[PDB]
Amino acid sequence: MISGSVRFLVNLESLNGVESIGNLTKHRTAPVVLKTSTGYLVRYVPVISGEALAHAYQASLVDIAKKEGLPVGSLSSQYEFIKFSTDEALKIEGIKEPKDYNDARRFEVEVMLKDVIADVGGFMYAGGAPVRRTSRIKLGYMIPALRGDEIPAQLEAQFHVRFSNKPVAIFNVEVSSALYTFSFELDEDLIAVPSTFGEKVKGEEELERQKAKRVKSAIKALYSLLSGNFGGKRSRFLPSMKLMSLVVTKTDFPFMPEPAHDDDYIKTTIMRLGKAKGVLNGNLAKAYVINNEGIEVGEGVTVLSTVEDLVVKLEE
Amino acid sequence: MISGSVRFLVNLESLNGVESIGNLTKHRTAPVVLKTSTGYLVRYVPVISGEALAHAYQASLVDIAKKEGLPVGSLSSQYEFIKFSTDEALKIEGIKEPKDYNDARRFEVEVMLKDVIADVGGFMYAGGAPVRRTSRIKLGYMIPALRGDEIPAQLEAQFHVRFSNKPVAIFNVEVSSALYTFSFELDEDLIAVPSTFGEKVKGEEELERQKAKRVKSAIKALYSLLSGNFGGKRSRFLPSMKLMSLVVTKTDFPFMPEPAHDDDYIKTTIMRLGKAKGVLNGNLAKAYVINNEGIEVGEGVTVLSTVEDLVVKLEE
């Protein structure tokens, strides 16, 4: 697996919105329970849903897959990720629905040969014979650091007007600033592998012939999320991002490093990995760290200068 | 026995989506009465049942057992813990159904040898010769800490849309936050031990040979639960958990620390442990504590750092 936690610093931003009221466009918000020196407070904070990040990642994957030469679906080539949920998607793609349980496996192979996206990100098909497939990449909301008792985050409104010569045209937009964080997981030992139990079916050999390329492309697709390309309203509110701290872990056993809420989440996660290797009878474990805010790390770790080097070494 | 009480802090999740109405997926909630000077107030609070935790624990146990080498059933190799409940499972596995009461022990030994999960997990077989085996691990619902005159648990709704190029698409998801607490029990003194009265039957020697490995695996399986690898909707709603307080007691007799609701439960459970040992002529009684919220502890306790050391000491 490959797990990670990352910390961003965002200013004058509007990357997610929800239903509007009047001439006001809203920024997404959610509750959070923060433990302060006095007790357990409840606060409201701007959050960015994980599906925006998922959409950005899948779009980048589609681009790379098309550029390299791997198969890509019909609809997904236009950046519409309905995958194969409803019957119309099948009809456009030109595939037959499954008949009964015993045939289900065959379905999953065909859909998994026509579209790399349905492979990496999974899919569902409601109907007589459901065919589930859990995603191979997992993501969660982007909450600002809950360090201390003063959450660094602010949300304000701004006033804009549309010029005209014959008045007969005023709107308000919510803009934010914060120190965001998020964590991600991606298990690369289940890519290009059928996830339904049954007898062997033809074409699995072709699946196995491309495994290296599919895995390499899936790894490269993370450069998008790690560089700062996602969200919306980027035409006129281009945000000013910057990377501060990042921890990535490559292992052979289940693992989940520390959420980046505390100033010391690198040393703790490194020690936890060191002990987990022994306790779980693991064989491989490596930790990469990008540090820009000059916080304590520890000893015996690899320090990378940029994300390009991290992606290169992950691929190698 | 190994009993424990732990106190969690989860920020943003949907880990148990009971029911679904319209275009909305609903969380699970329970009523709680909060006492006030004016009177009483009924509030609704999120809760995660224990069945999901049991499923996660058994999945981890299967994954570990298949890696060590102990037997694992056929249907249980696929993550479908039906267990030998009806004739179909027996026919698939190939085990002769028990003839009458006298053969109950033989069938129990056979099943216990054929599948680890039926040993630790337990099973019930319906028929003219019913057989039973209570689970050797017990878990309870997860409820937030009813401390003071506030309930630090919020539960909002969120709006999401599926994009399309030919509009003709909307869903809502309930997202919660709270300070969760839960307690668990695990009696390792009954693992790999038949659970019926009668003359011994061939095969118990293999059970005695494998007892050590089975117990070690059962203890290793709790690392996943204590690490936060349960629930659903983990793909697009990856939560952010953290550990605050933990009390783990190992003894030679029934015992269960205080629920982690009050802000001081470590001291109370230590005192009750002393009294229980005094009254029950106990021989072994040890307690380990992890304290990150700076609450009162007392004296006569071992202070660890993380769950890895706790599991190592439990193994030793």
Place this chain on the structure above:
Amino acid sequence: EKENIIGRIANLLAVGFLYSESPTLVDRFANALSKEAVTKVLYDVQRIVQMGIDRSEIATTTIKDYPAVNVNSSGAKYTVVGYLPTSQDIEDFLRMIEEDVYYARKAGALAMSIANRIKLG
């Protein structure tokens, strides 16, 4: 009077729905599990009604004569029979919600019934 308060809240929700042509506030009100969700809808629906009042698209009238509210939306004319809630009705309704959020579901069901009958006619 609890039923009179609930009926006046249902009239407010029905006026807001007919004027906005959106069920979203009534859906939020009928699905509320907290005082926060109910209070947020009570503000947002009154804010919609305030815009209709300022535009003279929402007005009180009589239609024996019964009190009514005329609503003009997208060239459609609707008439809701009854009074809008007072500030005291909102405060007493919020106290009822602090005891039992069921009253929000009851008001939402009544509001949708009023709006459906008017839209059918």
Place this chain on the structure above:
Amino acid sequence: EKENIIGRIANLLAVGFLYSESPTLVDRFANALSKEAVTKVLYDVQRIVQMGIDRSEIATTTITIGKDYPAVNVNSSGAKYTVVGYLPTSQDIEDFLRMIEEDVYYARKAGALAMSIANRIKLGSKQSKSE
């Protein structure tokens, strides 16, 4: 005398509500859990009333309801309202703030009275326009 003070505070809140056409200050007053929230509303409502006085849209008068009663005339958005009673004195504000420092319940009582005054006046004004 406590009820007279509460009644005069309720008249001030009702005049401010009818003049501003906004319930927001009365909502804040009736939901107050601290002396800070109450005192902030007492300033903001008097600041609204001060603007109405300077514009000559708020004036003290007497009305025959056969004896003359003290009243306050309010003109807002071409509507005319008349609140019967006195506005609070500086001493009434100070004694009311002392009552709030003992029990914030008195802010809820004044808010409930103010909303009742405003609702009755708004209902009567709408009925006369419909006739």
Place this chain on the structure above:
Amino acid sequence: EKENIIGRIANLLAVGFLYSESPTLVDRFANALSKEAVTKVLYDVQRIVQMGIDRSEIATTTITIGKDYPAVNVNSSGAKYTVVGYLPTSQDIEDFLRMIEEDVYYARKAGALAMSIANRIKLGSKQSKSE
């Protein structure tokens, strides 16, 4: 002693407001988010009070409200006002600035008290002119 310091700062702000007839310094004080804004107002209000002292339009006095209480008489634009209490000492300003360096909340508390003092005095002065 913290409440006494806040009360003396509130008296200074109320005297400066009544003398200048401007709420601007009290608005700046109650909206302060930094020690800079608070300290700037503490200088500017004392500079206004210094001019009133030099003109003999601001003077300390005692008033019987049957014991004598310390007070400050303020003459502005032919209006006479009397604020009951002491003005802050240099030590009160320094201790108040230390309280602000810990929590800017105390500037809001002093501003709310100052506006309450000024409003009560202005209301009483307008009522006596109407009679």
Place this chain on the structure above:
Amino acid sequence: EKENIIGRIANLLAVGFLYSESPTLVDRFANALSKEAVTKVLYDVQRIVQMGIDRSEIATTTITIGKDYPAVNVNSSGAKYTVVGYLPTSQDIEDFLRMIEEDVYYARKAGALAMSIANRIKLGSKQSKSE
């Protein structure tokens, strides 16, 4: 020790102000944006104090406030003032100028303290004359 230096500079400014009856040097000190303006005031105030010393109108003394405290007596225009504390040493002036070369804020702090000392003394002197 930084606060003691600032307090001794504030005493010098207050003595110079009370003796000259002019706020001009304290105004210049509290508004300084450069080391030049601060140093010029430190010279000019000490030059005023030097004249008061030569005339025997400024003298060091002790006063019982039951222990003896160091003080400076100032006679100006037939008024008698007493400032409690020490005047700065040459080392205090030099260390204060080094503090100003790091941050001119310390001139504003000393000016605010000096004006507080002078105001309290002037208020007390006017009250005793009125009695």
Place this chain on the structure above:
Amino acid sequence: MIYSKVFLKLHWGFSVVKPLAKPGFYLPPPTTLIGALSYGKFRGVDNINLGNVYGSPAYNFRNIMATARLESEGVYTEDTGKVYIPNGRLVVVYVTDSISKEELEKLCWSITRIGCKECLASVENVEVGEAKKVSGRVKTRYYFRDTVKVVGRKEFLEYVTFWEENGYIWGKEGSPVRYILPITTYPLASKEVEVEAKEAYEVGGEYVVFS
């Protein structure tokens, strides 16, 4: 006759589903109490030969009297009837004349669940003593039989049904017996009631009625 009192600290609440839609019970039945008592001695066996059939490892204690009451307010939910009462407190009284005081005292420290697996419950303290039998008018909170007469106002009498010990064996249904509970329907609570008990034991300040 000897008696014991226990102070149980529930974790989140118990659960018992009625026999023969899965509604639950307001308070634990007597059979569950007897079984929870017996658990301490039979920790590790789920089947004992009764000589004709395997019914349960708890048929031994089928001649012990027990009752229980709540010390807080609880909420009954149907979402599988449950009685949520997190962090509450349950008071159970055992009246017995079979085993010695030490046996009952040690057993009373060996309870860790009432109902199903999830119904974890800690034990806070226990008391042991003797009981005096009387037949005069008394005031009680622990539930009693349906056959018991009532003298006070009929206000909080809830009629439920329970099963005799015969239900300890599988493939069989225990006989139905009516029972009366002095409880408030919503919210759940415990209230005292006067009764003209024919056989009531004083157990240290509280009167318990059995017939």
